[PDB]
C-alpha cells in the first residue's frame, strides 16, 4: 500500500517518485501514553495493522542447476521408486505448483540421477515459510541438443509488521515497534480518530527534528482542505513562518492553530490533562527484521573434540560465555555460576 | 449517597440524528467508566460476520493470494448475526464447518478481450477486467438454504474494488465467512467508528458586550455564540456545536475574560455501522454485553 | 497496488470510492477537497486515504505474461 | 493557488505510457554521466 506524500518538495514530481512510493501517510500523535514507547521505541495501532497498514512482501529467487558432459540428473520422477506424499508439492514434471505453501524440509523440486538409480529431491530450507510466485525453465547454452537442467524458482515471503521492525519519518526519527496497541486501549481524538503511529515526545528535545513538527500541521491541513503543500527547503522565512502558515490553515479548517487536538484516554475514558499534538506524517517502514538471530538451547549437539555445544542458531547451537563474562562471574565472587 | 433508582432519576438520553448507518445520541449524567465501557464493547466485543478462510483454486492476477484474501475479509457483509452459531476450534475441519456456523461466498472471474475503437476505457477494451465485492456469489448449503431465502448474503458496499485484471488472468476461490469479535481482528468490528466527545463548556466570566462580543463570536463556530443586542450581555446559544479549537484563548482581549471547560457527566456518542447491523442494535448489544459480563461473574464460584 | 478496503485509522469503507473520485475530478471538474466531501469523507484520516492513494496496479497490469504484445 | 499533487495526470500516465518524449527528463539527466561516458566509446568525433 504505497501512498503519495501530502507534504512534499516539488522535485518529488520532477523525478516522478510517484512511480515508486517509499512510504505511507499516517495519523501520528506525539504522545507518551502506553509506556512502551521511549527514545528508540514507537507504537503501531493494532486495528491499523489488521487493516493492512505498512504491509510488505519479500521475493527471493533460487537457481536449481544440474551441472555439479553426459546427462545423469533429469527433472521429474523415476519409476518403481517413490517416497510417500511428494505429489502434494510438485507437479508431474518434478517442478512445484506455482502458489503452493512451503516450509523448511518440504520438496522444492524433484529429479532422478542414473548414477545412484534413486529418485532424489532438492529441499527448501529457511526459518521463514513461503509461496511459489514464479517457476521458469531455462534450457540455453546448446544449439540442437536441447534438454532442461536449469530452473529459476521465485518465493513470495509475506512480511506483516512485527514487534522489532523499524519505522521512520522523513526527518531521521527511526524507532523499533515496541508493541501493536489495540484501538480500544489506544487514545481516541475528539474527531473519533486513534493514531496509526505513536511517537514519544522525549525523542524530539535531543534530535531537534522540527521539520517533523511542521510536517504534522502541514499534513493535517492538506488532508482536510485537500491540497498538497510544498516543503522544499528555504521556501519560508523568519517573517513568513510555516508554523503560522499551516496554523492559519488549521484554524480556517476548524482545528487548533498550534496543531493540538483534545484527546481522551482509552483506559480511563476521561479527557487527558492537555491537548495532544496530532497530525499527518509520511512514515517509512525499514526493510530489516531485527529478530532474525532469535534462538534457545537446552541440550543440543556438541563437537567431538571439546564436547562443548556446537556453533549454529538453526543447528540448536550454544550461546558463548566468553572471557569477559568469565571475568564478570569472577567479579560477583559467584564461583558456582562460573562452575 | 448513590442508588441505582437515584441514577434513573437523573440519567437522560438525547437522539440528535438517527440515520440507517450512523446514529448521534447523548448519554447525560452517566460515569466515564460506563460510557467508555460501551464504546470499547461497540468496537471490540460486539460480534460480527466477516470472511475468515479463503480457499483459492486459481489466482493469475497481479494481486497476491494473501493480499486478495485479506481484502475479502475486510469487505463488510450485510449479514445479521444471531442467525449464525459460534464455531468451535478444537474439533477438525470436517466437523468444524456446518450450515449453522459458516456462510460460503464464491468468486469465479475470467478476463477476456472485446473489439472496440481505441486512453480507451477498461470496461470497453476488456471483459470482466474489474472484480467488485458484488462478484462474491452467495452459495447456501446444508440443512438450511431456506433461512437465507428472504435474506440473501450481499456485501454492505457492493461497488468495493477487490481486483483488477487483464485478458488471460483468472480468480477462482471459496471464502468461508464466520462469526468473530472486533478485538481479534478489525475486520470483525461492526462499527466504522464508535466514539464519544464530552459536552464543551464555555464559562463567560465578564459580560464582554459591544464590538468585542462580535469578535468573541468569530472565535467559535457560527452556531455557538449568539448575541442578544449591543448590550444584554453575550450568551452561549449552542455549546454542543463547538469544535474546541481554543481560538478564543489566543487573544489578549479574551484570554482572561473567558474559561474553556467541559460537562464530565454529558457524552455525545457517534456510532456509524459497517452495514451488517443498525447503529442502535450495535449500542443495545454493547449494553447487553456489559450486563452479561457482570451477570456471568455473579453466578460464578469464587475459587481458592 | 489497489484502493484499500476500509480506512486504516477508523475503518470506514474507502474501496468503493476510488473510481467515483476520478469521475468527480474528470467529468465534474471539481477540486480535490470538494470531491472527497461528496463521497462522504469528513474525517482527515478517511480524507487522506483516497486523496493520497497512488493506484500502482494500473502500472503493474501493463506487464501481462498471458497475452501477446 | 497551491503546490498540488498531480492525481488525474498521474493515473492517466500510468494507463497510457507516453509514445513521444519520456516524462521526468531530470531522471535521465541523473544517469547522463554514465550513458554519455559509454556513448563516447564508439559515437562522436574522431570515431
Amino acid at each position: 500500500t504505497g501512498q503519495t506524500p501530502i507534504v512534499k518538495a516539488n522535485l518529488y514530481d520532477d523525478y516522478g517518485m510517484d512511480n515508486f512510493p517509499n512510504g505511507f501517510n499516517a495519523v501520528v500523535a506525539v504522545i507518551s501514553y502506553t509506556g512502551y514507547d521511549m527514545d528508540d521505541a514507537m507504537i503501531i495501532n493494532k486495528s491499523a495493522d489488521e487493516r493492512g497498514f505498512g504491509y510488505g512482501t519479500m521475493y527471493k529467487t533460487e537457481k536449481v542447476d544440474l551441472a555439479l558432459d553426459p546427462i545423469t540428473q533429469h527433472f521429474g520422477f523415476g519409476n518403481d521408486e517413490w517416497p510417500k506424499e511428494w505429489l502434494e508439492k510438485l507437479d508431474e514434471d518434478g517442478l512445484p505448483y506455482i502458489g503452493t505453501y512451503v516450509e523448511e524440509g518440504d520438496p522444492i523440486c524433484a529429479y532422478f540421477d542414473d548414477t545412484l538409480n534413486k529418485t532424489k529431491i532438492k529441499t527448501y530450507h529457511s526459518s521463514e515459510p513461503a509461496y511459489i510466485e514464479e517457476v521458469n525453465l531455462i534450457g540455453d547454452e546448446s544449439n540442437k541438443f536441447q534438454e532442461l537442467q536449469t530452473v529459476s524458482i521465485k518465493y513470495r515471503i509475506r512480511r506483516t509488521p512485527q514487534i522489532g521492525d523499524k519505522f521512520s519519518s522523513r526527518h531521521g526519527q527511526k524507532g523499533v515497534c515496541s508493541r501493536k496497541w489495540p484501538t480500544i486501549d489506544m487514545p481516541f481524538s475528539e474527531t473519533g480518530i486513534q493514531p496509526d503511529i505513536i511517537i514519544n515526545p522525549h525523542a524530539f528535545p535531543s534530535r531537534m527534528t522540527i521539520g517533523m513538527f511542521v510536517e504534522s500541521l502541514a499534513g493535517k491541513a492538506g488532508a482536510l482542505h485537500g491540497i498538497a503543500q510544498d516543503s522544499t527547503p528555504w521556501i519560508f522565512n523568519e517573517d513568513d513562518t510555516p508554523a503560522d502558515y499551516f496554523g492559519e490553515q488549521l484554524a480556517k479548517a476548524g482545528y487548533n492553530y498550534h496543531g493540538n487536538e483534545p484527546m481522551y484516554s482509552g483506559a480511563t475514558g476521561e479527557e487527558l490533562r492537555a491537548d495532544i499534538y496530532v497530525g499527518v506524517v509520511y512514515y517509512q517502514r525499514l526493510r530489516h527484521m531485527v529478530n532474525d538471530k532469535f534462538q534457545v538451547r537446552s541440550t543440543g549437539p556438541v563437537n567431538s573434540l571439546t564436547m562443548q555445544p556446537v556453533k549454529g542458531r538453526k543447528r540448536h547451537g550454544g550461546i558463548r560465555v566468553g572471557e569477559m563474562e568469565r571475568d564478570a562471574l569472577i567479579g560477583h565472587g559467584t564461583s558456582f555460576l562460573l562452575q | 449517597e448513590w442508588n441505582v433508582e437515584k441514577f434513573k432519576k437523573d440519567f437522560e438520553v438525547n437522539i440528535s440524528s438517527l440515520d440507517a448507518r450512523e446514529a448521534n445520541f447523548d448519554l447525560i449524567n452517566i460515569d466515564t467508566s460506563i460510557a467508555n465501557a460501551f464504546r470499547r464493547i461497540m468496537i471490540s466485543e460486539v460480534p460480527s460476520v466477516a470472511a475468515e478462510y479463503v480457499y483459492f483454486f486459481n489466482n493469475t492476477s497481479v494481486i497476491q493470494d494473501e493480499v486478495l484474501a485479506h481484502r475479502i475479509g475486510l469487505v463488510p457483509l450485510k449479514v445479521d448475526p444471531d442467525m449464525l452459531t459460534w464455531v468451535d476450534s478444537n474439533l477438525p475441519d470436517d466437523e468444524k464447518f456446518t450450515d449453522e456456523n459458516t456462510i460460503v461466498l464464491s468468486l469465479n472471474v475470467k478476463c477476456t478481450r472485446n473489439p472496440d475503437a481505441p486512453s480507451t476505457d477498461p470496461k470497453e477494451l476488456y471483459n470482466n477486467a474489474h472484480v467488485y465485492a458484488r462478484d462474491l456469489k452467495f452459495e447456501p448449503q446444508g440443512r438450511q438454504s431456506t433461512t437465507f431465502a428472504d435474506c440473501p448474503v450481499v456485501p454492505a458496499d457492493p461497488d468495493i474494488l477487490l481486483a483488477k485484471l487483464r485478458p488471460g488472468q483468472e480468480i477462482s476461490l471459496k471464502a468461508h465467512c464466520i462469526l468473530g469479535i472486533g478485538g481479534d481482528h478489525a475486520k470483525f468490528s461492526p462499527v466504522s467508528t464508535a466514539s464519544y466527545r464530552l459536552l464543551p463548556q464555555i464559562n463567560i466570566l465578564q459580560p464582554i458586550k459591544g464590538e468585542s462580543a462580535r469578535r468573541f463570536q468569530k472565535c467559535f463556530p457560527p452556531g455557538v455564540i449568539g448575541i442578544d443586542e449591543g448590550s444584554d450581555e453575550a450568551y452561549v446559544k449552542d455549546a454542543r456545536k463547538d469544535t474546541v479549537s481554543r481560538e478564543v484563548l489566543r487573544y489578549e482581549e479574551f484570554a482572561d475574560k473567558v474559561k474553556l471547560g467541559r460537562v464530565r457527566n454529558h457524552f455525545i456518542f457517534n456510532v456509524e455501522s459497517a452495514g451488517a447491523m443498525t447503529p442502535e442494535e450495535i449500542f443495545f448489544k454493547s449494553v447487553r454485553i456489559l450486563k452479561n459480563k457482570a451477570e456471568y461473574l455473579k453466578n460464578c464460584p469464587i475459587t481458592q | 497496488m489497489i484502493v484499500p478496503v476500509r480506512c486504516f485509522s477508523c475503518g470506514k469503507v474507502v474501496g468503493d470510492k476510488w473510481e467515483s473520485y476520478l469521475n468527480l475530478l474528470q467529468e465534474d471538474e471539481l477540486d480535490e477537497g470538494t470531491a472527497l466531501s461528496r463521497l462522504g469523507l469528513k474525517r482527515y484520516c478517511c480524507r487522506r486515504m483516497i486523496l493520497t492513494h497512488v493506484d500502482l496496479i494500473e502500472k503493474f497490469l501493463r506487464y501481462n505474461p498471458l497475452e501477446k504484445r | 493557488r497551491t503546490a498540488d499533487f498531480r492525481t488525474l495526470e498521474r493515473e492517466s500516465r500510468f494507463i497510457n505510457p507516453p509514445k513521444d518524449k519520456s516524462a521526468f527528463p531530470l531522471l535521465q539527466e541523473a544517469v547522463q554521466p554514465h550513458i554519455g561516458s559509454f556513448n563516447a566509446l564508439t559515437e562522436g568525433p574522431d570515431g
Binding site: 482542505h225 491540497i227 513568513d240 502558515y245 492559519e248 476548524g254 | 463556530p221 463547538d242 457517534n270 | 477537497g33 | -
Partner: peptide, 24 residues
C-alpha cells in the same frame, strides 16, 4: 523576497459529531 502564496477560498471542513456543513 516573495511570501509563500496562501490557498484561495479556504473554508471550514471540520465540525461536531452530529453536525454537518449546514451553517454558512
Amino acid at each position: 523576497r516573495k511570501d509563500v502564496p496562501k490557498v484561495e477560498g479556504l473554508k471550514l471542513e471540520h465540525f461536531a459529531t452530529g453536525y454537518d456543513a449546514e451553517d454558512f
